[PDB]
Design a protein around this motif. Structure first.
Motif, short mmCIF file in Angstrom:
data_model
loop_
_atom_site.label_atom_id
_atom_site.label_comp_id
_atom_site.label_asym_id
_atom_site.label_seq_id
_atom_site.Cartn_x
_atom_site.Cartn_y
_atom_site.Cartn_z
N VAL B 1 -36.45 -23.94 -86.61
CA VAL B 1 -36.22 -24.85 -85.75
C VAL B 1 -35.61 -26.36 -86.42
CG1 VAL B 1 -38.35 -26.77 -84.83
CG2 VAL B 1 -39.10 -24.43 -84.85
N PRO B 2 -34.44 -26.23 -86.37
CA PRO B 2 -33.93 -24.54 -85.63
C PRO B 2 -32.72 -23.83 -86.95
CG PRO B 2 -32.46 -25.90 -84.96
CD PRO B 2 -33.73 -26.89 -85.64
N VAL B 3 -33.03 -22.43 -86.94
CA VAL B 3 -32.36 -22.36 -88.25
C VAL B 3 -31.29 -21.89 -87.82
CG1 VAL B 3 -32.00 -19.54 -89.64
CG2 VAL B 3 -34.75 -20.60 -88.47
N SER B 4 -30.38 -21.81 -89.44
CA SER B 4 -29.09 -22.25 -88.83
C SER B 4 -28.42 -20.94 -89.82
CB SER B 4 -27.99 -23.28 -90.13
OG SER B 4 -26.93 -23.32 -90.51
N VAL B 5 -28.05 -19.77 -88.49
CA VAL B 5 -27.21 -18.81 -89.04
C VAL B 5 -26.16 -18.63 -89.44
CG1 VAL B 5 -28.54 -17.38 -87.99
CG2 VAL B 5 -26.82 -17.83 -86.70
N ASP B 6 -25.66 -19.01 -90.46
CA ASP B 6 -23.82 -19.66 -91.15
C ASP B 6 -23.84 -18.47 -91.97
OD1 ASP B 6 -25.91 -19.30 -93.98
OD2 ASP B 6 -25.60 -21.75 -93.93
N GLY B 7 -23.96 -17.28 -92.31
CA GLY B 7 -24.17 -15.92 -92.94
C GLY B 7 -23.63 -16.20 -93.98
N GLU B 8 -24.35 -17.52 -94.36
CA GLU B 8 -24.17 -17.54 -96.35
C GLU B 8 -25.72 -18.36 -96.51
OE1 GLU B 8 -21.47 -17.74 -98.58
OE2 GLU B 8 -19.91 -17.18 -95.96
N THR B 9 -26.36 -18.78 -95.86
CA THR B 9 -28.09 -19.24 -96.66
C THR B 9 -29.38 -18.89 -95.66
OG1 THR B 9 -27.56 -21.06 -95.24
CG2 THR B 9 -26.73 -21.11 -97.30
N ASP B 26 -29.51 -20.87 -84.55
CA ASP B 26 -27.76 -22.38 -84.33
C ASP B 26 -26.70 -21.97 -86.08
OD1 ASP B 26 -26.61 -24.99 -83.14
OD2 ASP B 26 -26.16 -24.41 -84.97
N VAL B 27 -25.82 -21.14 -84.38
CA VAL B 27 -24.28 -21.14 -85.49
C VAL B 27 -24.10 -22.13 -85.64
CG1 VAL B 27 -22.10 -19.80 -85.49
CG2 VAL B 27 -24.89 -19.04 -84.30
N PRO B 28 -23.59 -22.67 -87.38
CA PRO B 28 -22.84 -23.59 -87.51
C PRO B 28 -21.33 -24.23 -87.56
CG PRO B 28 -22.85 -22.60 -89.09
CD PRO B 28 -24.24 -22.10 -88.29
N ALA B 29 -21.27 -25.28 -86.97
CA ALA B 29 -19.48 -25.37 -86.22
C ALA B 29 -18.37 -24.80 -87.13
CB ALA B 29 -18.99 -27.07 -86.30
N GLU B 30 -18.84 -24.98 -88.46
CA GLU B 30 -18.03 -24.67 -89.41
C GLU B 30 -18.14 -22.95 -89.41
OE1 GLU B 30 -18.82 -26.73 -93.22
OE2 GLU B 30 -17.22 -27.42 -93.23
N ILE B 320 -29.25 -11.34 -100.79
CA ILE B 320 -28.04 -11.07 -100.77
C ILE B 320 -27.02 -10.13 -99.57
CG2 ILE B 320 -26.13 -9.89 -102.54
CD1 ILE B 320 -27.66 -10.26 -104.58
N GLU B 321 -27.94 -9.01 -99.43
CA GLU B 321 -27.68 -8.33 -98.01
C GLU B 321 -27.31 -9.29 -96.57
OE1 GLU B 321 -26.86 -5.16 -96.30
OE2 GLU B 321 -25.66 -5.62 -98.07
N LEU B 322 -28.32 -10.13 -96.69
CA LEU B 322 -27.90 -10.37 -94.86
C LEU B 322 -27.16 -11.48 -95.06
CD1 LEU B 322 -32.20 -11.79 -94.42
CD2 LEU B 322 -31.31 -10.50 -93.38
N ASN B 323 -26.48 -12.31 -96.00
CA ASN B 323 -25.89 -12.67 -95.99
C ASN B 323 -24.56 -12.54 -96.44
OD1 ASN B 323 -27.38 -15.72 -94.91
ND2 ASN B 323 -28.19 -14.99 -97.03
N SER B 324 -24.05 -11.28 -96.22
CA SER B 324 -22.99 -10.22 -96.83
C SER B 324 -22.41 -10.28 -95.56
CB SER B 324 -23.41 -8.55 -97.38
OG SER B 324 -24.64 -8.18 -96.86
N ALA B 325 -21.15 -9.51 -96.00
CA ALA B 325 -19.92 -9.13 -95.07
C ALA B 325 -20.62 -6.94 -94.51
CB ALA B 325 -18.76 -9.36 -94.97
#
Lengths: 526, 526, 525
Positions: B1-9, B26-30, B320-325
């Motif tokens: 509310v809302p979750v940030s999917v930044d591929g890092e946290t 929500d995908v952050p601007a950066e 670790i996996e969730l935030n990996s490529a």
């Protein structure tokens, strides 16, 4: 049409007709007679407040508790209620019917002291489409499942119509039927047996054999598509050399299936082709001809044969079980009440675990045959992954192989259940069979094999037109091919495969390809 | 509310909110910036028809096939279609959302060279309730599942609304959305990862911890109902003697859960009662007092502790996996394209198999505690099988124990999948993980434990009023008891139990008893 | 003298040759249709035509054609390069059962191997020269057999008093001249299921004895605890549930308990319990049990199920033993058959099922032990069968642990007939892993002797602790004496490890079963 449940001659096939095809069930007059007389005699002994397990005593561990005959109906009634504790998914209609059919047959044998009314009511539910809502999980091998069934007999529990559970009471009124009242030993005899695992396992084993057959069918087609040797199936190598019943059968079904092929080759032709190819190479020369083919295309009789052997053994155990008095205690004439454990599903528990194993391997073989035609280095000249156009740009069946390969791994994670006894009920049930877990495991591998074989049928048919070998196929092979193509089009450019596979898998779960051969050829498969 | 999917946290808990509670993503601007710039650079290299796996070459084994950039969109498009070959059941909404959320996060990390449009579209499906119809079976560990997801991104395949699959194309028009067109590497990056097993496994592990907690809750209640010793949970024995993280936690949750009990006893009281009871017996005298209780009521910290340890390890791997490529090939800046295998789910494959094991034992303990209170010889003075009236005539919980005992055996037949690799695709995929099979195995044992624990909650609550010990229960125990009783009435005479059990099991699958403690006590469970 | 004719060899026969060094003979007939087959066959090899293994490469190498002038090199290169077995070496009897199986196979007549091959094999068996066969390597049995085929050509290693010694010295040290492998001889020696069929034979033969010994002690225990006979009455099996195995176990249980003074007929129990009931129209609490627990009542069902599995296995082994599980095959004016009768799937399944069956047999034995050691369930006996001051003494409390531990270990053994892995390129894309299957069964059987050993001791202990030795039927006393003759009663507690292992080795010898046969004439099925 109609099946006779006499507790003496019921067969697995007969059980499937009642379950799958809604065949009419009929309890013979001599059986009802045996029941009536048994009831009258047993009633005269119960009437004397004599100690009889679960008639004038508590259940399981609480057998040490004595109950007066004045609590006849309450005793049996609390039993069913308190034991209706099944959980999990509800069995499909055909599955629930097999279980009821198996129970009825048990009681109809005459050694259960049940009133004819019970035999009558059960058959009425079957003949009139009243299907109990039986939860899959609960039995230690089959109290819970059967208890849920027994509930609908007294207007309790739920009946499964349209896939959802509906209060039995209501459905009965909506049909005019009047709920029964459980008398001496009747609630007990209704739930104290192996009907759950025996009914479900009958269906499983019957189909298992059908799956063995359809496995032989696709294999024949593949062999014809890749033009393999017919030598491996020569009757001498089995009927004489290694006379394993199932091995002999599979070998015969293979020879009949391929009779009339122009695509298959014979060892005599293979060696001559090699002899003339070794025209003057040296001493040791590398050829491109294979005097023999990989195990996946040559050891079919041995592997599928052993599967059959296991399948025949299971059907034989089931045949004996279906016509047994899976109940306790038991009544005989002019003898003391038998107090034993014929409710113990170990015999079937073992049978179904073996089926799981045997079917798992049947799928292993199918998987490798798929891999066989998709690998250009092993397909004998077929385009990589059966791509008909530009490989790379198109993957053909590349992706379709995965669900089949993943399924072989999944079936391998299903371990035997017949050895997983856990002591319960104050240690009174220190050793059980878990037979219903075993049967469901077998149902799962069976269901999974259909998916694997589906990918195989699509690949074969695809292999056939890509090589343009349709005119050379034997009559049976052309039947098999057309049945596949009548459902799914040849693979031109890449396309969504999920639906195609699930479509042939359904055809497979209903014996379609086994039917195609029966109406298109004169072949009689074992 | 809302979750940030930044591929890092992104966290497991965050994934569950998106999946279960429909939290806005929500995908952050950066992140979009990193994507855009990556796309532009990567596009400039693909534009030079340079060899790049799955961008200008065929897939898997057919990597040896070179494709011209003029076939950019066809290449990626045939891939998704031909690989959408999943079979079996469709994942529930919450499960499919976790998988999509995991994918999006992977790509949003920036090393996948995807156009921002893809990140945008995925988040749009999540934020707007467009759920893909993902078949459970197919991945070798997760092509098939992800391919089915990727299909809906281009207006193909099916979306799962109301539990049934509906042609995606239609739903999109019914929402105004316009199908995307897969460009360079976009179909590949959408399916070439571990999002299937990582998304599903996140849910499993998150609940697993919740199941550990609710397991601790019921156990506390039982200990209070049978008045056991509190000694086993003294902080010295763990924090000092055997400092296993999870062991220390469980011990602490037990002490907090029982704080305020009048029913529990302390070792100091136990020995004094024995000292005064050995008043003058002899040298060796048989007492009726137990200075200690059975393992099931004393080794809870060790057993449930190890389960936690396993659970923490799995969550850490998932984090670790969730935030990996989870993708290949990968793009970095000022470097050559990375050509590896980060799509290989082995790390999570191992994690989920361990969860299966750990949860299986958690259920073994629950089962034995049930047996504990139902056996008059071990319940410490409770009526046999918690029958409140006339035993024998009534079985009480006798039958209800079976589904729990049978479930322990069923969970034991589920073997590890992470070691069941089968070579496919022309031997190109000679070693895989089957991670999605592992996660589903874990989901099954998890689901099964709920049923086992349900039987435990009902037994405890029943044990409480039969002994008439409600006034002595601690605050937490009274909370637990009332939560149970608010759903299912105390057991008077025997009655149909199936519904009662399935009712508490559902309460359990949604953290009800964990909530009851949060709104009724000041307790903060680890 | 065991007749190895590839037609009538039996599982029990195989054991006699392996365990009791029974002598073996190849019938003139078999040895006759061997030289003959060899004759016509050899006339085919001469013409240098394609024949797998004979004039071709092996496995996926079948594409490599080999001219007849390499007849000896081919067979030799094969055997030496496939001798890659690792792990432990099979025991003397195990190594022997394998050799016998391979002979019987080649004595069937369709392998087209020179008669001296069958001859020389029999000699090894008849003279005590046992090959050193490592257990691991077979995919179901090239390697295990490749080590056997080596000793025949004076190579590899033989098994001498436990260790492996060069076949070279032993042969020269015994006046035997190694052989030279000719056309198709090397392949024929290693291309079959002899390791699994051989080992399986020993395992199934012993499994059946274990079922017999499980029943013996079970009967002892049912007597020592005054159980009911109702559960074993013929009407309940022979009539109500016709499972062959169930019937057999019931029969043995009736025969073993026959003439006991401690057992109770159902009628008596019924009358006993009834007498113990007050009147009214109520529910009473009694201390009597009309029926006993499953472990003491459902013996016919569970053990019978085991028997059915063991019967089916012996069946498959009997067929396999007398089969031409070799390749390719030769016949009368027939093309050279090219199949896969070397595929052990049939025995791989049989043994996997045995592993499962035996495991349940152990589960049941273990629970009976728990049954007698728990005062709440022993029907009277003292806690953990202590003779003196409990607590101070633990009695059998400690001996129960290895029993319960073994059931767990046996349960960790999974089916092997399904774990096929593709090798040899992709030529062997589907194998059976049968020799692993047989070894899993060998392990569970071995562990069951330990579980049983504890049960046999507990039984004797409970007998002379309750003081019912004079009530024990003829068979029961026989079993009892059998135990005491090995381990005395347990007064104070002591080191148990030696007693247990003693009763376990005895069990693996058939010490019991032998006792009932001698001291009673009772013929157990």
């Amino acid at each position: 049409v109609p099946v006779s449940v006499d507790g003496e001659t019921l067969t697995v096939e007969a059980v499937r007709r009642v379950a799958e095809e809604r065949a009419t069930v009929d309890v013979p007059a001599e059986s009802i007679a045996k029941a009536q007389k048994s009831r009258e005699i047993f009633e005269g002994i119960a009437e004397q407040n004599i100690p009889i397990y679960g008639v004038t005593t508590g259940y399981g561990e609480m057998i040490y508790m004595q109950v007066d005959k004045s609590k006849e109906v309450e005793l049996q009634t609390n039993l069913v209620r308190s034991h209706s504790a099944g959980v999990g998914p509800l069995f499909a209609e055909d599955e629930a019917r097999a279980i009821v059919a198996a129970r009825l047959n048990t009681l109809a044998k005459g050694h259960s002291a049940v009133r004819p009314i019970i035999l009558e009511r059960l058959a009425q539910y079957l003949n009139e489409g009243i299907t109990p809502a039986i939860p899959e999980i609960g039995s230690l091998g089959d109290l819970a499942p059967l208890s849920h069934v027994a509930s609908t007999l007294i207007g309790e529990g739920y009946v499964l119509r349209d896939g959802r559970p509906v209060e039995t009471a209501q459905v009965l009124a909506e049909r005019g039927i009047e709920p029964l009242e459980l008398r001496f030993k009747e609630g007990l005899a209704l739930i104290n047996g192996t009907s759950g695992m025996t009914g479900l396992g009958s269906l499983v084993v019957g189909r298992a054999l059908e799956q063995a057959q359809q496995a032989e069918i696709v294999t024949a087609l593949l062999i014809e598509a890749v033009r393999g040797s017919t030598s491996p199936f020569l009757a001498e190598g089995h009927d004489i050399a290694r006379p394993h019943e199932g091995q002999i059968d599979t070998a015969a079904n293979m020879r009949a299936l391929m009779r009339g092929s122009g695509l298959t080759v014979e060892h005599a032709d293979l060696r001559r082709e090699l002899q003339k190819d070794k025209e003057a190479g040296k001493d040791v020369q590398r050829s491109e001809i294979y005097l023999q083919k990989a195990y996946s295309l040559r050891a079919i009789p041995q592997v599928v044969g052993a599967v059959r052997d296991t399948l025949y053994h299971a059907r034989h155990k089931l045949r004996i079980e279906l016509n047994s008095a899976n109940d306790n205690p038991l009544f005989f004439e002019g003898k003391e009440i038998f107090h034993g454990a014929n409710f113990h599903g170990q015999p079937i528990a073992f049978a179904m675990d073996f089926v799981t194993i045997a079917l798992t391997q049947l799928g292993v073989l199918a998987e490798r045959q798929i891999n066989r035609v998709l690998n250009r280095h092993l397909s004998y000249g077929l385009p990589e992954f059966l791509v008909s156009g530009d490989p790379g740009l198109h993957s053909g069946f590349a992706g379709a192989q995965y669900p089949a390969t993943a399924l072989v791994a999944e079936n391998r994670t299903i371990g035997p259940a017949s050895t997983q006894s856990v002591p319960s009920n104050g240690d009174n049930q220190d050793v059980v069979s878990m037979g219903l877990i075993s049967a469901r495991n077998a149902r799962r591998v069976l269901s999974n094999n259909n998916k694997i074989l589906a990918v195989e049928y699509l690949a074969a048919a695809q292999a056939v037109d890509i090589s343009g070998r349709f005119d050379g196929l034997s009559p049976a092979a052309k039947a098999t091919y057309e049945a596949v193509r009548r459902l799914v089009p040849t693979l031109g450019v890449d396309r969504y495969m999920a639906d195609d596979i699930e479509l042939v898998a359904d055809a497979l779960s209903r014996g379609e390809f086994l039917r195609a051969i029966a109406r298109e050829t004169d072949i009689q498969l074992r």
